[PDB]
From a paper:
ATP-binding cassette transporter B6 (ABCB6), a protein essential for heme biosynthesis in mitochondria, also functions as a heavy metal efflux pump. ATP-binding cassette transporter B6 (ABCB6) is a homodimeric Type IV half-transporter comprising a single transmembrane domain (TMD) and a nucleotide-binding domain (NBD) with an N-terminal extension (TMD0). The TMD is responsible for substrate recognition and translocation, while the NBD is involved in ATP binding and hydrolysis, providing the energy required for substrate transport. In the present study, we determined cryo-electron microscopy (cryo-EM) structures of human ABCB6 in complex with a Cd(II) ion, which is coordinated by two molecules of either GSH or PC2, at resolutions of 3.2 and 3.1 Å, respectively.
However, in the presence of GSH, only Cd(II) significantly increased the ATPase activity of hABCB6core by ~2.4-fold (53 nmol/mg/min) at a saturating concentration of 800 μM, compared with the basal state (22 nmol/mg/min). The structures of hABCB6core in complex with Cd(II) and GSH (or PC2) are shaped like a lassical inward-facing transporter in which the substrate-binding cavity within the TMD region is open towards the cytoplasm. Along with two molecules of GSH (or PC2) with an orientation perpendicular to the membrane, a Cd(II) ion is positioned within the transmembrane pathway of hABCB6core below TM 7 bulge loop (also known as plug). In the Cd(II):GSH structure, the central cysteine of GSH interacts with the Cd(II) ion, functioning as a major coordination site for metal cation binding. By contrast, the glutamate and glycine residues at the N- and C-terminus of GSH, respectively, are not directly involved in Cd(II) binding. Instead, they form a network of hydrogen bonds and van der Waals interactions with residues within the cavity of the transporter, primarily from TM 9, TM 10, and TM 11. These interactions help to neutralize positive charges within the binding cavity, particularly from the arginine clusters (R435, R439, and R552), thus facilitating the stable accommodation of a Cd(II) cation. Consistent with this structural analysis, alanine mutations of the GSH-interacting residues (R435A, R439A, N498A, Q501A, N545A, T549A, and R552A) led to a partial or complete loss of stimulated ATPase activity. Compared with the apo state, binding of Cd(II):GSH at the interface of the two TMDs brings the TM bundles and NBDs toward the center of the transporter. The CASTp program calculated that the cavity volumes of the Cd(II)-bound structures in complex with GSH and PC2 to be approximately 2312 Å3 and 2573 Å3, respectively.
Residue numbers in the entry:
A (entry chain B), B (entry chain A): 240 to 826
Write the structure that this text describes.
Amino acid sequence: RDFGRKLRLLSGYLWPRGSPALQLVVLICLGLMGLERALNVLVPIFYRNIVNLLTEKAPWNSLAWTVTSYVFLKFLQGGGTGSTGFVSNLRTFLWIRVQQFTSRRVELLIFSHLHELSLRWHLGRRTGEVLRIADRGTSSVTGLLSYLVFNVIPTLADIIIGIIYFSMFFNAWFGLIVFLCMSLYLTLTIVVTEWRTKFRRAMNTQENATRARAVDSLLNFETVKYYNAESYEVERYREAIIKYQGLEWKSSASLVLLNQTQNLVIGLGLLAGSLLCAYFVTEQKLQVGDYVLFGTYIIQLYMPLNWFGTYYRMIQTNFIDMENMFDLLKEETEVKDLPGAGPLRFQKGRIEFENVHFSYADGRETLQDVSFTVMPGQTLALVGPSGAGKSTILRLLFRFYDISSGCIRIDGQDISQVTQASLRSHIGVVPQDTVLFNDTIADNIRYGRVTAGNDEVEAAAQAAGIHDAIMAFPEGYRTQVGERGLKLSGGEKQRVAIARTILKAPGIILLDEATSALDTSNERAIQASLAKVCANRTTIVVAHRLSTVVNADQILVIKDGCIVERGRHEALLSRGGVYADMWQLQQ
Amino acid sequence: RDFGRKLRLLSGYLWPRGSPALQLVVLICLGLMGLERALNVLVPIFYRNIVNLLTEKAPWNSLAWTVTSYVFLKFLQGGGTGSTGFVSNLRTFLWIRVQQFTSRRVELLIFSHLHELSLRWHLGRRTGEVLRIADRGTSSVTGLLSYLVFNVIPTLADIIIGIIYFSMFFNAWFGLIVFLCMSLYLTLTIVVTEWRTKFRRAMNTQENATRARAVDSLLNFETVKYYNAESYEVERYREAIIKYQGLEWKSSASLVLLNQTQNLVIGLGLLAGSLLCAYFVTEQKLQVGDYVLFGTYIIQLYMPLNWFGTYYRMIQTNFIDMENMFDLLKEETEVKDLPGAGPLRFQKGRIEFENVHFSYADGRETLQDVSFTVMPGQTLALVGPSGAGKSTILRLLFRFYDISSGCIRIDGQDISQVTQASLRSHIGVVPQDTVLFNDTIADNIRYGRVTAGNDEVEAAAQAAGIHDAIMAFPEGYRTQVGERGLKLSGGEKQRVAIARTILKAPGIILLDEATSALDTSNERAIQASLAKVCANRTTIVVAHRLSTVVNADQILVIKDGCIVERGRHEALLSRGGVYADMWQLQQ
Ligand SMILES: N[C@@H](CCC(=O)N[C@@H](CS)C(=O)NCC(=O)O)C(=O)O
Ligand SMILES: N[C@@H](CCC(=O)N[C@@H](CS)C(=O)NCC(=O)O)C(=O)O
C-alpha cells in the first residue's frame, strides 16, 4: 500500500549521514532494544524457577542466589509499563542527542529552502499557516520515527516471540489461546478506533468554532454601545457550549467503549488460559510455577498494548503531516533563477530600456513598451497618479520578477544573464515604510556588511550626521530597539535607512520617498545627505512632490504603462503641455 | 500550608449545588472509588489462595471455581496501570457528565461577570491575555479537581491500607520495609521534581523565544530587498537552535534521573522484601503463596506512584492558574454602576450642561466648564481641530465614564443616579467605524430588538430603502456575511447602521458623521434618511464638513476644553467670529 517508498524515506532520515560519532550511538541503542526484548521474555522463566525451588524445600543458598539474580534482572528490565527499567532509560539518554541532531538538520534545511523562494508564492499564503505547517512537519519527522521504531515494532516482536515460546516450550493449546486473544484485541481496537476518529474530529471542529465565537464578543465591544444585548450574547454562548458538550460526551464514551472492549478480550483470555493451566496442573502434567509464569507473562505482554490506540491514531496523523511538509519542500515553482554562470561587471552604471512589456497580475496588462535611458549620475524621477505602476517598475529594476517580454540591460549587459547576488548588492533601496526587526542598533547598522567592523559604523555616524543623535541616547549601542523596545518616529527610521545605505556603498539608488509630514529644513537636510551619498552615482526617485523634481535632470510621467515625455529638461520646459499639471501640483 | 481554604473552595465547586439529579451521581462515583480501592487490595488474597490450593493438590472442582472467581475479580479490578478495570471506566462514564455540568456553569459565570466590566479596564489590557487567563482558569478548575480527587487521594489511601495489611496479617517487618521504601520514593521524587522544574521552565522560555524569532524573518521580507543576508539569518537561527537544544538536553537528562532514582528505590525495596520473605518461607514460618502475594502487591503500588511523581508539577501549576482566575473574578474595578435603586422615565429629551469638568487621562484636564442646552429636533453640531474632545463628550452622553465634577441632567433628571438600562435604551448611537462579527445580515438587522419578529425587519427594509440591495443578493437574508463571508462597502455598513437605528426607534440620536468619501447623491439620500428618522427627534452631529452644519440650528467649537460660540443659527452667522474658519473650511 505504497508503504515502501515511505519507509525508504524514513530510513533515509534515520541514519545520521554526517558525523561518524553517532552511528555508534545508534548501534548501541538498537543493541539495548534487543537486550530489553530478551529480558522481557527471560524474566518470567526466572520467576518460575524461583517458585519451583521454593515448592520443593530447596536449601537456603540456592534460593538466595536465585532470588538475588531475579531481583537484579527485574531492576534491569522494565519494572512496570515497559518504559521504566535501566535499559529503556539509557536508550532514551542517547536517543535525545541523536534526535536533537536530526531535528536541527531538518529544521535548518526546510528554513533555508523556504527562505529561498520568490515573492509571489510568499504573498500567495499567510505566514502563520506556513509556519504551522513547518513546525508540525519537523515534529512529525521526529515523533513518527520515535513512536514506530521504539513502540510498535518492539511490541509486535514481543507478541511473536511469546507466541513462539508458548507454542514450543509450554504446550500446543496455549499458543492458540494467546494468538486468538491478541488477534481479537488488535482488530477490535483498530475498528473502534476508526469510528471514534470520526465522532472526534467533529469535536475538534466544534471546539474551534465555539472558541472563535468567544473572541468576537470581547474584541468587538459594541454591545453596550448599541443596546442592552448582554442577554442575547449569553444565550448564544450557552447554545454553543451545549453543542460542544454534546459532541464531547459522545467522544468520551467512545473511549470508554474501546477501553472496555479491550479489558474484556484480555480477560476472556486469562480465563481461558488460567483455567486450562490449572486443569493441566492438577493432573501432574505441569508444575506449580507454570501457573504464575503464565499469569505474569500475559499481564506483562498486555501492558504495552494499552496505548495501541493512541498510537494508531498518531502514526496516522503524523503521516499526513509528513505528506504536507514534503509536498511543501518538493515544490520547484520558484521561477526567478539564474543562468549557468556569468558575474556582473559594474563599470559605470549604464541603464537602458527596450520596449519592455510586463504585467504582474493576469488577464490585463499594466506595463507595455516602456523605454528610457538614464545617464550616470543623473537623478531621474518618476511621477504619476495613485497607481501601482511606479512600484512595478521599481521591482523590475531589482530583478524581483521575470520579464514576460522585452529586455533589461545594465552597462551593456542584460540583467537576466547574471546572478542575483552582485546585481542586488550594487543597488540600495529605501522603501516607504522602513520597518525593523527586534535587535540593537549596532547589528542593525552592521546589517549592511557582515564583515565590516565598527570602523564603518563610526564612519557612517560621522557622515550621516547621526553621531550626536545616537550619543544623545544614554543607553548606548545596547539599547532595546524594535517593537520589544522603545518606539521611534518615521524620520528616525528613514535616517537609519540612509545609514544602512551608506553601509552598503551601492552603485545605484532606487530610492522611494516617504510621505511623512515634516518641516522643510529636515527634509532638505535629508535630501542633501541623499545627494551626497548618490553624488557621481545613478539615482532614481519616486515622489509626488516637485521639490525633488525641479532640480532633477529628467522627469518621466507614467500613465498605465505609457510615457509621453522624453528628452532633456529644457525640452520639457519648452513643451508647455501638462506643465499646467505641474503648476497646479506645485501648490 | 494555606491548603485549607483552597480545599474548601474545591469542595464547594465539587458538589453540584444545583440540579438534584447529580448528587446521586457523585455518591455513586465515590462508592465506585471505594469499591475499586477494596478490590485492588483483595485480589492478591485470592491469588495467594489459588497458589496455596494448587500446591496441596486440591480437588478439581474447588480449584476451578476459585480460579474463575479470581479471573472475574481481576477483570473487575484494574487489570494493569490502574485505569483499565470496569469500575474505573464506569466512574469516568459518569464523571464526564458531571464535569461538563460544572465547567459549563463556571464558564458562563465568569463570562457574564467579565462582560459586566467597564471600558477603561478593557483598554488596560488586551483581550487575548484575559481570554487566555479565563480559559486556563476553567481548565484548571476541572483538571485539578479530577487529578486530586481521583489520582492522589486513592494512591495514598492504597499505600496506607497496604501498610496496615502487611503490618497486621503478614508480619512485623514487611510493614517497616514497605514504609521505608515508599517514604524514600516520595521524598526523592519531590526533590528531583523541583530541580527539574527549574531547568525546564528555562526550556519553555527559550522555546518561546526561538519560535517568536522565526515569525520575524517571514513577516519582515526585507532580506532580499536589502542585501544577500540569507547567511546572517541562517547563522542566527542556527545559534538559537543550538541554545534551545542545550536546554532541552539538560531537561531530558534530568528526567532520566528521576526515573531511575525511582526504579531503584523500588528495586532496593523489592530486593529486601523478597529476600526476607524467602528466608522466612524456608523455615516453615510462611506459605508458598505468600511470596507471589508480596511480589504482586509491590508492582501495583509502583504503577500508581510513578505517575504520582509526575502529578506534583501539575497540581502546583494549576493552583497558580486557579489563583489567577479567582483574582480576576474577585476584581471590583467597575466604577460606572448604579445606586441602590431608581428607574428612569423619559418624557421628551431635555438636555442641559452645567459647568462640568472631566479628565479621562491623568495629570492635566481636558474638558472643563462645558455648558450647552439643545431644543428638541435641533441638530446641534461640534467642530474643532484634530482633537478627541468631540468623541469624549460623545462618550459622556452615553454614561460610559463617571463625571469628575459637575452636574449632568436629562429631562431635568440627573443621570449619575439612574439605571443604565433605560438610559442606553432610549438613545441610539451611530459610530464611525461600525465593526460587526461573524453572522448573517439578517441577525445584524434583528439586533435592534431580540423580541422583534420579521415583520419589523420587512418594515424597516421598506422604510430605509435597503430592499433593493437585499433582492440584489441571490442568497437573500441567508447570505454568509462578515469577515469570514464576503466583504461589504462603507456605505452599505453605514446604511445597515441606520437600519438598526430604526429598529431601535430611539428618542435621542447621538449620531456621529461617517468619514467616507462618496458621491454627493448618495450622501444627500443618507441625509434625507437621517432627517426622516430624526424628525421631531433630538439630534447631535459631529463632523468636519459644512454639509451637516449649513442646516444645523446651533454649532459649537471646542478649543482644548473651551467653548466660545453660542446662540441661534442666525445669531452665530451674525456674530462675525470664526466665520473666517467656516469660509476657509469650505474650500
Ligand atoms: N484508551 C486508550 C488510552 C490512551 C489514553 O488514554 N491516552 C491519553 C493521552 S495522554 C488519551 O487518549 N486521552 C485523551 C484522549 O482521549 O485522546 C487506549 O487504550 O489506547
Ligand atoms: N517518568 C515520568 C513519566 C511521566 C511522563 O513522562 N509523562 C509524560 C507526559 S504524557 C511526560 O512527562 N513527558 C513530558 C515531560 O518530560 O514532562 C515521570 O515519572 O514523571
